[PDB]
Amino acid sequence: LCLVCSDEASGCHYGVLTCGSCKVFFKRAVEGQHNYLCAGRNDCIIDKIRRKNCPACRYRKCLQAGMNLEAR
């Protein structure tokens, strides 16, 4: 299971057991430019449904999980 947006995970990538999308998301969200906002809220729960409400919390969530694009 995806330990970010709490969905059926395809396989682990980077540092943690994530879905298919959280992989690609994270690699953009780290080594790229981002425009996700929960920089001064950080309220919403990111799961299988509510992740469409906010892709900002997902970055925070995956990081708490232990994601690292230079993990092992």
* Chain center to CA of 47: 10
Among positions 19, 29, 55, 59, the unique one binding Zn ion when judged by CB under 5 A: 19
Among positions 5, 16, 29, 67, the unique one binding Zn ion when judged by CB under 5 A: 5
- Residue pair 1/7 in contact (Cβ under 8 Å)? The answer is yes
The helices-and-strands tally (H runs, E runs) of the chain is: 2, 2
- By rule CB under 5 A, what count of residues binds Zn ion? 10
Q: Which residue has the tokens 């969200």?
A: 29
* Interaction between residue 67 and Zn ion (CB under 5 A): no
**Residues lying near Zn ion in the complex (CB under 5 A):** 2, 4-5, 19, 22, 38, 44, 54, 56-57
